[PDB]
Amino acid sequence: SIPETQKGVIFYESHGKLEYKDIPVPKPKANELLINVKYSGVCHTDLHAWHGDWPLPVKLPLVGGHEGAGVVVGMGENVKGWKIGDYAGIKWLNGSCMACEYCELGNESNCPHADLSGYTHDGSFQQYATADAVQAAHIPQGTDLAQVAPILCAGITVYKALKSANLMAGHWVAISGAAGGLGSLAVQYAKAMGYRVLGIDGGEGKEELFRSIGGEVFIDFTKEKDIVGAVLKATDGGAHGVINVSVSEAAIEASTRYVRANGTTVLVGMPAGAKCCSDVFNQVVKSISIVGSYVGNRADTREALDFFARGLVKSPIKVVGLSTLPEIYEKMEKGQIVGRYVVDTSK
Amino acid sequence: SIPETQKGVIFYESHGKLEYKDIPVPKPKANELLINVKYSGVCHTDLHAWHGDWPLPVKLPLVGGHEGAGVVVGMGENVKGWKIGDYAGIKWLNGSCMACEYCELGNESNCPHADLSGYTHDGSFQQYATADAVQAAHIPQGTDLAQVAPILCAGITVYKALKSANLMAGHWVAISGAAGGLGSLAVQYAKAMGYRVLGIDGGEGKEELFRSIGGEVFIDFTKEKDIVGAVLKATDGGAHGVINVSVSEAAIEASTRYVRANGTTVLVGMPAGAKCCSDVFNQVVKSISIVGSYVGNRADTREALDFFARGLVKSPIKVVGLSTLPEIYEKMEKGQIVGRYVVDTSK
Amino acid sequence: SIPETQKGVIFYESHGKLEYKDIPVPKPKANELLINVKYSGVCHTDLHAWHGDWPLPVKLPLVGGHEGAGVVVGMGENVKGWKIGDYAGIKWLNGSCMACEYCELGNESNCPHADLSGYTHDGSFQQYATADAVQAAHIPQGTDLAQVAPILCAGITVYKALKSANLMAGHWVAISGAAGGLGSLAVQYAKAMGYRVLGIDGGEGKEELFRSIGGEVFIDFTKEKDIVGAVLKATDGGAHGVINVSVSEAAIEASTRYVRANGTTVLVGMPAGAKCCSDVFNQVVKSISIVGSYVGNRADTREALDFFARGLVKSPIKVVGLSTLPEIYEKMEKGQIVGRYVVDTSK
Amino acid sequence: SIPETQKGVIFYESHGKLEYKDIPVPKPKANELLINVKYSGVCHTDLHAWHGDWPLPVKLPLVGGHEGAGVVVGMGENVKGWKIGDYAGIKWLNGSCMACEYCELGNESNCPHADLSGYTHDGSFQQYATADAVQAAHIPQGTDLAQVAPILCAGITVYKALKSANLMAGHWVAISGAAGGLGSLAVQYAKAMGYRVLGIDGGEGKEELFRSIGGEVFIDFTKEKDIVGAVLKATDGGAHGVINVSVSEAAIEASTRYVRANGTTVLVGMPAGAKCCSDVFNQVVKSISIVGSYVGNRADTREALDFFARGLVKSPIKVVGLSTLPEIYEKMEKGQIVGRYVVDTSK
Numbered sequence A, B, C, D: 001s002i003p004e005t006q007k008g009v010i011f012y013e014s015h016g017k018l019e020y021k022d023i024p025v026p027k028p029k030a031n032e033l034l035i036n037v038k039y040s041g042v043c044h045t046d047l048h049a050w051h052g053d054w055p056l057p058v059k060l061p062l063v064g065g066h067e068g069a070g071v072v073v074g075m076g077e078n079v080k081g082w083k084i085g086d087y088a089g090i091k092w093l094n095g096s097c098m099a100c101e102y103c104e105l106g107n108e109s110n111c112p113h114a115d116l117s118g119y120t121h122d123g124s125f126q127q128y129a130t131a132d133a134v135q136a137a138h139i140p141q142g143t144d145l146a147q148v149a150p151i152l153c154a155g156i157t158v159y160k161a162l163k164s165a166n167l168m169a170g171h172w173v174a175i176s177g178a179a180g181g182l183g184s185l186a187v188q189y190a191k192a193m194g195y196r197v198l199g200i201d202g203g204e205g206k207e208e209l210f211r212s213i214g215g216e217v218f219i220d221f222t223k224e225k226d227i228v229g230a231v232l233k234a235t236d237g238g239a240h241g242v243i244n245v246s247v248s249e250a251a252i253e254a255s256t257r258y259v260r261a262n263g264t265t266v267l268v269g270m271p272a273g274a275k276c277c278s279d280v281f282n283q284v285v286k287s288i289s290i291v292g293s294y295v296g297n298r299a300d301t302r303e304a305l306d307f308f309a310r311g312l313v314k315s316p317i318k319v320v321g322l323s324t325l326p327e328i329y330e331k332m333e334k335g336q337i338v339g340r341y342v343v344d345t346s347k
């Protein structure tokens, strides 16, 4: 069958206590799939949802997590092109209204009535989770769900971000936070897109990981006292594009100073209460764009999962049990997560 | 002939005393035209060069002014396609190196070795001024030089800025400072480009001018206490594009908040020591680009002067004498300049 | 109620006999609206569907017409954001699969499983017609349905085509067939988009109409023996963009020769068995793009209907009865349709 | 010194007799470099110039060749940033007017007064050749001139062509003629740009070369009777982009049929008297662009030579003597040139 009770990590108040307990199995709405979430990536956005670091409020009590890879155990009556047993991906964008100007254009993420897994919708830190069938990701059969789970928010995000920077092949892309969860996949997406990857990160295991996944230049922010000058030399004038997948505001500000003239600084990371204080003179006389970038749409999901399918991207994951989700968060705020963490909801 | 002495407004120290006295007539270099500057637009950048409001240093003693419209009285030996008597325009970009990556691409303004009239090169607040012949603007014969002078920095700038905002016809463009020197021409360029122009300015004669030149919605910043909300209503979700041609940093910051999702806030105005402190969360979840924009290139100059030629743009100018240049600056810092001021170098 | 029988123009074989008789009222599927089609534009595509001029086969017996403007008299159970009494527009794209790569990207028209009103789906030459609710056009209340009907295929088409030509404001756009049904709206969309409109058409009432709707240069193909030379002079080097809304193949070929270097020739008209024989040398040494363009998507529909709402476009329509649909087709093959014809389904 | 006589291959009438004899050494004009052409690539455009296969006429008597890599032995007085001994590249675009709208925009190749090496200017099939210093390619020191010579017309061309197809990383690019001189470099540029390369060529040594340089799918046009169907399967719907670097018109036409919906067929090859007869219906209902592409500009030259510098592209060259240039042409019309031929002007 589909059971009545399931295991999930749920918190009832912000920065309170994540309880791995038994919660009721959700019922899929007319348009939603019920997905047996096998593995789920643990994004930093989940730490932000728990701490309430962001302006928007979350749907308490909340089962976070928005990188779920699972099998469709049930569907709604109005779900059309989906089978039971198919591989589905719960992304951050649970669904959207698919009618507003933004949605029609393609910008489904920047939509007023966009449902958000792991914030406004009980996400994928649970064995069974519902997801709007139009926005759920189609994961090909015979795919390692643990390996594809981080591609559902980190992969599509950094793919849309690297497309957001208006880079060309051969252009320098500085990925700020290049050994984190999103940065370690941005390095691989950018190399597969043709760019020269510069990496800025620091800590135990960060430079080694960055060199592992194919990065070109690594600049350790805990050792480099002049980061802007270091990325004004490595790059020969600045990085034609910058991807801020850090959780630091000082990194977001330095990225505006080591970007090339006519370059694009994409803001992807969303630290708590951070502002991108950009010098107006330097941004104008260099014609620097500062582009915010939200999670990708269905087209970006298809393209990022296709990059994953060809074996070009491979997020460095450690699969732990869902029981361990408290200890991941306390390991994620301390910057000690090298690559991605994926939780076995079973365990 | 070409005389030995000429009249020019020259200052020897920043925010010192602008002296309208007799200075030697320059000699055109091998690549430069000597232009009998008949009329010259007075930009706010000239007030910034005098006050030294900007990071870069100016070439003291300096004859400012970078909107000169004049006749070519002499040329250099290596100048090719130019006649004596032709109408030339001294723009902010006096010249460029025309060899570096940026110059080759087309971004001649963001070039390391770009010569700048009215900053690093004795500009057009003088009867005779030299200008690199490759970057000088070709003004058609039978043109009102007084009327075309403001198009040489304000016009090409706001044209490149409106092209920088990635707007489409019918999209809302909020021009911040829409009755100033650059804003009053941005309103006209945007309407001729097809956009719905919202205007934000305030003071005596600003709303009336804005309504004169064809603006749609005017929002008076000295009366409107909620500017962001007012431009979130007029526009129905925010302005698809914003052009910051203000000299205020609070305007630059509010423009990041009343821009539409997936909209572009172009920074054109460069107030003294201003920073574009942008909320990272709001910029990311709305995918807002913040694009700096410098003066246009030769293509943008050609296209903006073609817009002027068809009679579509007409900067509201008051032609005073060059003798009056001190009194313009003290009228420009006080925000009391409605439209543009143009100086008769003769007078 | 909703009646059992209705009046419609139906043909049972290609180029057979259009019978205005009583046909059963359709039943809306789970996703479809039943639209009381008040007025319907008569496109040339309907003449092509009747003659079978196109490669694809039509769904016999067929009730053509794909420019229906009507009120929603009934809906399906899975239709979400729609009211009874709302104004809906049956476009050529009746619906789409909204799942394939093209649909996800935004290209809903170039979709393998795209349902097509007036070809593969009983269209809008009938009092009551069904239309997929996701693709039906939202026509604002208090709109002249007769006046908005031609905007449902001609308007969105020529809007997407003018966006397809990668034109800028001030650039020359040669609309081939500028007094026809699509050309007369392309002239107005292009002028509202900022372009200089050149018009090529010929016959009684074509030049007068073209001058009426705001065209700049008219070149009469029945009087001009050198059309390419005439549009190499008017334009000063060729038209930066060309829109082929003709039903002639010689026009489609000449458009490749009077387009500017680096210009774009958009093919919109689809004459019977026509080929765009383009000289490869001239297309390469001038870097001329030849872009085919299909009907617009939901975003283009929204933007074109917004242009119509502001009063910027106004298709020259003559509203006749649906009874007269045979006599329109025989007037449309002879090129004698100046502007658009709209049929009162009531009459 | 610089000698008075030199060795060059010169023909006095079209398809006449190429004579390797002693011709006078040219004198550099005020803006031109005299380049000791060490090695020169032999393009098919040189065979077209000899046969007079193209509409434009050549400058008889003509020393063809437009892929010269050499050292600057002398300069003109108005040449600015150049040294004697530097490595210069004579490309097809010898120079341009650098003042017309196209040149200002960046499209220096599609310019009315563009000087063309190997057609309108004695090219690089000679020991000493002059080249406009603004358009000459800057080849880094310590570069294999024989290996960089084919990058001067083939490399920059196929780079600009792959940028012309509006492809994204992961998209399918079908290179028609993928083992020829331009195709063998288009395969490498496309793989370094991130695309999946499909190759269409045939003959001895073509499939082996294509597999050597990193191609994914090879489709042999002499064995495949259904080329369109084969490239509608390999690609799963058609190639998102096609690069026609063939010398066949049937290939140019089939490329319009095996391109994906919303795909771009770039015409690069310019066979004799060829026309791109494109079905208008299929091009419109699939929104297929057919983009002609001429040699790249200075920015594309810089970017293609940078790709070469990183070791990412490596044209398969055979360096023969200049004495052998007749036997290359008779080997190039027969399609028997696998990769590129480079002539030692010394030999």
Ligand SMILES: NC(=O)c1ccc[n+]([C@@H]2O[C@H](COP(=O)([O-])OP(=O)(O)OC[C@H]3O[C@@H](n4cnc5c(N)ncnc54)[C@H](O)[C@@H]3O)[C@@H](O)[C@H]2O)c1
Binding pocket: A043, A044, A045, A046, A048, A153, A154, A157, A176, A177, A178, A179, A180, A181, A182, A183, A200, A201, A202, A203, A206, A221, A245, A246, A247, A248, A250, A251, A267, A268, A269, A270, A271, A293, A294, A295, A296, A332, A335, A337, A339, B284
């Ligand atoms: N905008 C979007 O679409 C989107 C999507 C996913 C995540 N995010 C946001 O991205 C942020 C990062 O997510 P993650 O999963 O990569 O987090 P993570 O904690 O796994 O990785 C962050 C990385 O940043 C590095 N870093 C810290 N300070 C730095 C500095 N000063 N300079 C450079 N690098 C520095 C850390 O050492 C670590 O390597 C979070 O705020 C998350 O919410 C945004």
Ligand SMILES: NC(=O)c1ccc[n+]([C@@H]2O[C@H](COP(=O)([O-])OP(=O)(O)OC[C@H]3O[C@@H](n4cnc5c(N)ncnc54)[C@H](O)[C@@H]3O)[C@@H](O)[C@H]2O)c1
Binding pocket: A284, B043, B044, B045, B046, B048, B153, B154, B157, B176, B177, B178, B179, B180, B181, B182, B183, B200, B201, B202, B203, B206, B221, B245, B246, B247, B248, B250, B251, B267, B268, B269, B270, B271, B293, B294, B295, B296, B332, B335, B337, B339
């Ligand atoms: N980036 C470029 O290429 C470029 C080119 C030219 C000028 N500029 C810069 O643009 C700035 C403005 O130049 P200008 O000639 O338009 O100056 P101006 O003084 O003539 O006009 C400025 C306008 O801004 C209005 N304004 C002031 N505070 C405002 C606020 N809070 N909100 C909205 N509007 C406000 C003023 O009332 C006035 O109408 C200067 O700093 C100048 O150096 C930049």
Ligand SMILES: NC(=O)c1ccc[n+]([C@@H]2O[C@H](COP(=O)([O-])OP(=O)(O)OC[C@H]3O[C@@H](n4cnc5c(N)ncnc54)[C@H](O)[C@@H]3O)[C@@H](O)[C@H]2O)c1
Binding pocket: C043, C044, C045, C046, C048, C153, C154, C157, C176, C177, C178, C179, C180, C181, C182, C183, C200, C201, C202, C203, C206, C221, C245, C246, C247, C248, C250, C251, C267, C268, C269, C270, C271, C293, C294, C295, C296, C332, C335, C337, C339, D284
């Ligand atoms: N691709 C699309 O999305 C799309 C959409 C709608 C219509 N169409 C096609 O567009 C074509 C035209 O449709 P319409 O409604 O405008 O037709 P129409 O018959 O109302 O107008 C055609 C116009 O072309 C003019 N014309 C004829 N020969 C010409 C020539 N040699 N040069 C210039 N002009 C010439 C006619 O005189 C007339 O003015 C049809 O084939 C139709 O199917 C395509």
Ligand SMILES: NC(=O)c1ccc[n+]([C@@H]2O[C@H](COP(=O)([O-])OP(=O)(O)OC[C@H]3O[C@@H](n4cnc5c(N)ncnc54)[C@H](O)[C@@H]3O)[C@@H](O)[C@H]2O)c1
Binding pocket: C284, D043, D044, D045, D046, D048, D153, D154, D157, D176, D177, D178, D179, D180, D181, D182, D183, D200, D201, D202, D203, D206, D221, D245, D246, D247, D248, D250, D251, D267, D268, D269, D270, D271, D293, D294, D295, D296, D332, D335, D337, D339
């Ligand atoms: N537009 C430009 O900027 C530009 C630049 C350089 C060359 N060109 C033109 O490109 C053409 C090719 O130049 P090249 O140096 O590559 O020539 P080449 O002769 O060295 O190579 C041509 C290749 O096409 C292959 N081919 C032949 N028939 C084919 C078919 N039916 N289908 C697929 N492949 C086929 C041949 O076997 C060979 O592999 C010439 O006409 C040249 O003038 C254009």
Ligand SMILES: [Zn+2]
Binding pocket: A043, A044, A045, A046, A066, A092, A153, A154
């Ligand atoms: Zn996430």
Ligand SMILES: [Zn+2]
Binding pocket: A096, A097, A098, A099, A100, A101, A102, A103, A108, A111, A112, A113, A114
């Ligand atoms: Zn929405």
Ligand SMILES: [Zn+2]
Binding pocket: B043, B044, B045, B046, B066, B092, B153, B154
């Ligand atoms: Zn200025």
Ligand SMILES: [Zn+2]
Binding pocket: B096, B097, B098, B099, B100, B101, B102, B103, B108, B111, B112, B113, B114
């Ligand atoms: Zn430069």
Ligand SMILES: [Zn+2]
Binding pocket: C043, C044, C045, C046, C066, C092, C153, C154
């Ligand atoms: Zn139609």
Ligand SMILES: [Zn+2]
Binding pocket: C096, C097, C098, C099, C100, C101, C102, C103, C108, C111, C112, C113, C114
């Ligand atoms: Zn589809």
Ligand SMILES: [Zn+2]
Binding pocket: D043, D044, D045, D046, D066, D092, D153, D154
């Ligand atoms: Zn060549």
Ligand SMILES: [Zn+2]
Binding pocket: D096, D097, D098, D099, D100, D101, D102, D103, D108, D111, D112, D113, D114
């Ligand atoms: Zn030129």
